[PDB]
């Protein structure tokens, strides 16, 4: 066969009409790697086009160049491996359509419906059929159409690589049960097809394709195996990809009976109503050779008449929606660049689906809208939406000058200059965000640099930019889109260390915050920061075809931290411990080890010293494994406690020998390499790999790298210093001697452990310091440990090594961004951003989870605020924070009383543990003065503390901020 990428490399595309929409499509397609993209337009540039088109320039409008031919050079630069060809050939009923035969797909924008029909008829007639996609954006309303032909074959629906399964046994019968390895389960559907290869016994099944039915989980019936010989061992099955045929109808047939996907199920009949209106607009242009003028009652009425007439011609009758028609007549002359970017992304992906068959296509129509952006304006004045001659006239005709002015003065904080961030900046510039010199300021920050990429290459970044900061480069590139835009580019990462740089003042000055991140931790840190300063947050994510948008407004919605996360799929326990097959296994095992060595032991010991009841809690927990925790504590306390960095180094050398030689050798003693399983098949077969233990070498850098990282980290856990001297560790390692290994064939002690364990009083001022993992900071050694630990484990199981950069990406499970999804997500996030700057109600804001592979777009209203109340108290949102002003001389009792006196609820305890009733000397803690009780050590004006009220158990409360001085 030929791959989806190979198919794009052989395929040519024809795009007509180069407004904002035609460009957005061309951009994404050329970045994707289409062999040839033939741009075509007939009109010459105009000052209005500067608002919609991000490559056009003031110079081009004066010279009256053809829209396409002015932007061809800037588009071709995007992807130099693609042949972009311009065309000015006039398009009429006269013009022959024979020149379109060469193109595999044809995309039409800004074209009459009659001419579009004629082309559609020609495209679907040809053999093989030429695929047809029509997209237009008039005002805040859009239309998208797909007609790939009467029959279209989708070669790959899931878009995933075919699965491989390992067979434990096949019964000889008709329905002969086939059961997979107990270790390796299969997720198969009752209709799927498998091809079996390298089976023992049933030699006939090696070249056969059988349908399988899963009547019982983890088993299936392939067919009649009674004739065939009996199965012994082995048997790998490969999923067979089966094409899915979807049928299409011509444009003329679909207008009369449209088949639209529903974006928002709240308004299920909304797409058909839009179809009626959009089709009326086309008739209005045909009858009067112009678009409806804004605020003209005659035009708005005539359109409603047409829409009323069309509603009769439609199959299901629908009832016309007057609100939609009215808004269409007003905005018909305008162009909303973010909606265009969103429609552009989707439309683009459909083209790829047509030349590749990589996903199931759109079924005919898709109507997207920004009605939520205008509905909240009520019934506004028509004078607002009149053109003033500037570049933003197109936007003004959609949202009115009032909201345009709010955007111009905005102060946005863009966290992350990745693919989403770069698109966001282009969407900002067309919208005119932060273009007013007096007030507006966009602040964008990203700490990373640019990479060669070559594939999945970004449109702002170019080759000569390689190894130059992302944010700086984008900012400089963005100004070329809109000169008036004001951007403050920074290289600082948004994390606790920079909280001084991005202080509470900064967040309060910023009117909106937008996140373009790839890790959840940073999302939570930004969400928390925005909650304290009571500012909104706009999050987005891209995972291949899938994307998501979450809008968080102050006091109207919940936060990102509230929204909880499901556990990711777990690599089978035991497969990670003893049978790794891939670098993904060793990398994950190292992270499992890191927490099991440098974090969890330290917390267990610190918990033993702090809690006198720790001993009871652990006895109660998980019988038969309290012994394991207890012995692990006594080991860290006594046996393995290092008093010197050399003791840390010896512990690293002894640990390296146990994980990569002794533990291996005992597994081999249990499961020797010659050993065979039931059915006389080798045990180290297929997914299982025979390891070979390693021998420590000072000269080998992997061996040294492990010791050097482990010891410096081990020292941190106990508070010791580290030296970081390789030669010193090397020479010393020769001197140390390691205990010999002996493999093994295979509660009175638990009482002994209770006695042996040193009582906490006996160990004074001893504390251990858990380490939390941070990939970013390479001077930590945190990542250095992981890379070594994985690559060394790979050596043992004959798995290929993993570089630093490769391993980092594998650990992040980061997916390369795709231009279709990012452009879509970024347009939607931009649209919501308009609603926020307007201060719109909760109802207007709508989140969105989309997947272009299906395709399905889901619009949902945002999650409402959830107020939490304690018995006989007032309810408090997440956004609320309680503030207490004190005197310089105060007590915790005088505070607790003051809490009940203001709000009507009194705290049982207070955390920063500062005071518990159960704690001994609770009357001492309650008499303590406030400056002695809490020591900021910076004589801070205020201190933030937690509060809890118990009606059974204690229940949290909203954060409390106390001011030492009333002032």
């Amino acid at each position: 066969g030929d791959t989806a990428m190979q198919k794009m490399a052989k395929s040519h595309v024809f795009l007509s009409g180069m407004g904002g929409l035609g460009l957005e499509i061309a951009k994404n397609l050329v970045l994707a790697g289409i062999k040839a993209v033939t741009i075509h337009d007939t009109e010459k540039c105009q000052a209005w086009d500067l608002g919609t088109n991000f490559f056009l320039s003031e110079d081009d409008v004066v010279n009256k160049r053809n829209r396409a031919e002015a932007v061809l050079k800037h588009i071709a630069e995007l992807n130099p491996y693609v042949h972009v060809t311009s065309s000015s050939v006039p398009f009429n009923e006269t013009t022959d359509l024979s020149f379109l035969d060469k193109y595999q797909c044809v995309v039409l924008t800004e074209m009459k419906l009659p001419l579009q029909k004629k082309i559609n008829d020609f495209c679907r007639s040809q053999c093989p059929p030429i695929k047809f996609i029509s997209a237009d954006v008039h005002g805040i309303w859009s239309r998208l159409f797909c007609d790939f032909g009467d029959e279209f074959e989708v070669l790959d629906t899931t878009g995933e690589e075919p699965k491989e399964i390992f067979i434990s046994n096949i019964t000889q019968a008709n329905p002969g049960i086939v059961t997979c390895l107990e270790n390796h389960p299969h997720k198969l559907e009752t209709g799927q097809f498998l091809t079996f290869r390298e089976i023992n016994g049933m030699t006939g099944l090696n070249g056969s394709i059988q349908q399988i039915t899963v009547i019982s989980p983890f088993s299936f019936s392939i067919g009649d195996t009674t004739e065939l010989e009996p199965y012994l061992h082995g048997g790998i099955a490969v999923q067979v990809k089966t094409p899915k045929t979807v049928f299409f109808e011509s444009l003329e047939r679909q207008l009369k009976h449209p088949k639209c996907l529903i974006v928002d199920f709240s308004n299920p009949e909304a797409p058909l109503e839009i179809h009626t209106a959009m089709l009326a607009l086309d008739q209005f242009q045909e009858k009067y050779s112009r678009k409806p003028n804004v605020g003209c009652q005659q035009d708005s009425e005539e359109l409603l008449k047409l829409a009323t007439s069309i509603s009769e011609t439609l199959e299901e009758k629908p009832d016309v929606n007057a609100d939609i028609v009215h808004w269409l007549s007003w905005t018909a002359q305008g162009f909303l660049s973010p909606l265009a970017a969103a429609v552009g992304g989707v439309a683009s992906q459909e083209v790829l689906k047509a030349v590749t068959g990589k996903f199931s296509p759109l079924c005919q129509w898709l109507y997207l809208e920004a009605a939520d952006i205008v509905e909240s304006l009520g019934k506004p004045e028509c004078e607002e939406f009149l053109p003033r001659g500037d570049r933003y006239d197109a936007l003004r005709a959609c949202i009115g000058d009032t909201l345009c002015q709010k955007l111009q003065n905005l102060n946005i904080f863009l966290v992350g200059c990745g693919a989403i961030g770069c698109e966001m900046l282009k969407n900002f510039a067309l919208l005119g965000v932060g273009t007013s010199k007096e007030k507006g300021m966009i602040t964008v920050t990203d700490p990373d640099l640019i990479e060669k990429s070559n594939l999945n290459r970004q449109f702002l970044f170019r080759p000569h930019h390689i190894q130059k900061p992302k944010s700086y480069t984008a900012a400089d590139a963005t100004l070329k889109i809109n000169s008036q835009i004001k951007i403050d580019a920074h290289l600082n990462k948004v994390c606790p260390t920079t909280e001084t740089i991005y202080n509470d003042e900064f967040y309060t000055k910023q009117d909106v915050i937008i996140t373009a991140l790839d890790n959840v931790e940073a999302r939570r840190y930004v969400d928390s920061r925005c909650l304290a300063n009571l500012r909104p947050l706009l999050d987005s994510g891209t995972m291949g075809t899938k994307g998501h948008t979450e809008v968080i407004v102050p006091h109207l919605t919940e936060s990102y931290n509230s929204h909880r996360d499901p556990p990711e799929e777990e690599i089978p326990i035991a497969t990670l411990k003893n049978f790794p097959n891939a670098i993904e296994h060793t990398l994950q095992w190292a992270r499992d080890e890191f927490e099991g060595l440098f974090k969890q032991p330290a917390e267990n010991v610190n918990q033993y010293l702090t809690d006198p009841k720790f001993v009871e809690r652990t006895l109660r927990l998980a019988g038969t494994q309290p012994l394991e925790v207890l012995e692990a504590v006594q080991r860290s306390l006594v046996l393995q406690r290092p008093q010197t960095w050399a003791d840390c180094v010896t512990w690293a050398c002894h640990h390296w020998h146990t994980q990569y030689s002794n533990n291996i050798r005992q597994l081999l003693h249990n499961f020797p390499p010659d050993q065979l399983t039931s059915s006389g098949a080798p045990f180290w077969s297929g997914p299982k790999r025979c390891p070979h233990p390693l021998t420590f070498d000072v000269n080998n850098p992997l061996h040294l790298d492990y010791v050097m990282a482990a010891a410096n980290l081990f020292a941190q856990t106990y508070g010791l210093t580290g030296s970081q001297d390789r030669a010193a560790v090397a020479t010393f390692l020769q001197s140390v001697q390691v205990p010999e290994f002996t493999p093994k064939s295979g509660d009175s002690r638990l009482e002994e452990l209770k006695a042996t364990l040193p009582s906490p009083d006996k160990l004074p001022g001893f504390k251990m310091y858990p380490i939390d993992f941070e990939k970013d900071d390479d001077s930590n050694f945190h990542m250095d440990f992981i890379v070594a630990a994985s690559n060394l484990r790979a050596e043992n199981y004959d798995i290929p090594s993993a570089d630093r950069h490769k391993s980092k990406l594998i650990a992040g499970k980061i997916i390369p961004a795709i231009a279709t999804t990012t452009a879509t997500v970024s347009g939607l996030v931009a649209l919501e951003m308009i609603k926020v700057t307007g201060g719109y109600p909760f109802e207007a804001y709508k989140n969105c989870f989309l997947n272009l592979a299906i395709p399905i777009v889901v619009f949902t209203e945002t999650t409402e605020v959830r107020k939490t109340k304690i018995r006989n108290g007032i309810s408090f949102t997440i956004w609320d924070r309680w503030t207490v002003h004190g005197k310089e001389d105060f007590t915790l009792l005088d505070f607790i009383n003051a809490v009940k006196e203001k709000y009507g609820i009194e705290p049982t305890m207070v955390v920063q543990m500062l005071y518990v009733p159960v704690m001994p000397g609770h009357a001492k803690r309650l008499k303590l003065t406030m400056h002695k009780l809490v020591k900021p050590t910076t004589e801070k004006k205020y201190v933030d503390l937690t509060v809890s009220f118990a009606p059974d158990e204690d229940l949290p409360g909203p954060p409390v901020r106390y001011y030492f001085s009333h002032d």
């Binding site: 899931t158 989403i420 987005s540």
Partner: protein, 154 residues
């Protein structure tokens, strides 16, 4: 602002404040406070035209009227719903209008193996949330419930 009048064969005339932009559902909620209570009974009509609940008064061409009037009328508790998976994996579940939201999430847990506490579903474009009833959300036969997983990248 507006005043809306409701004529009923077996019930008293109802007059209350209203807004043209507000939905017919909002009018039915306004009716509930003044008389009869709940909207499930209500099936509003004007002349010969049926009035859909989601559509606004302005969607039916109401304009330049200080006050408007409508003729209210009264007309399968267990229904079939199909629950869409994270990756093109539909399921069949039976629900009733009088079902607690947690009960329905528990059905998803058996079907998908996803704990109901952390389940994320969207029904008729409204996030499916705890402490609610299916009737409150508004459910009709043939509706679809969508399961979603959050995406990270870019």
């Amino acid at each position: 602002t507006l005043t809306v009048h409701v004529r009923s064969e077996e019930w008293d005339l109802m007059t209350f404040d209203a807004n043209p932009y507000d939905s017919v559902k909002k009018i039915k909620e306004h009716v509930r406070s003044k008389t009869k209570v709940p909207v499930q009974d209500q099936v509003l009509l004007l002349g010969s035209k049926i009035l859909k609940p989601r559509r606004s008064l302005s969607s039916y061409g109401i304009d330049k009227e200080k006050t408007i009037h409508l003729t209210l009328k009264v007309v399968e508790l267990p229904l079939f719903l199909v629950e869409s998976g994270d990756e093109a994996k539909r399921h069949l579940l039976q629900v009733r209008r009088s079902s607690s939201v947690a009960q329905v999430k528990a059905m998803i847990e058996t079907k998908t193996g996803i704990i109901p506490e952390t389940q994320i579903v969207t029904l008729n474009g409204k996030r499916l949330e705890d402490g609610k009833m299916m009737a409150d959300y508004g459910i009709r036969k043939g509706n679809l419930l969508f399961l979603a997983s959050y995406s990270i990248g870019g």
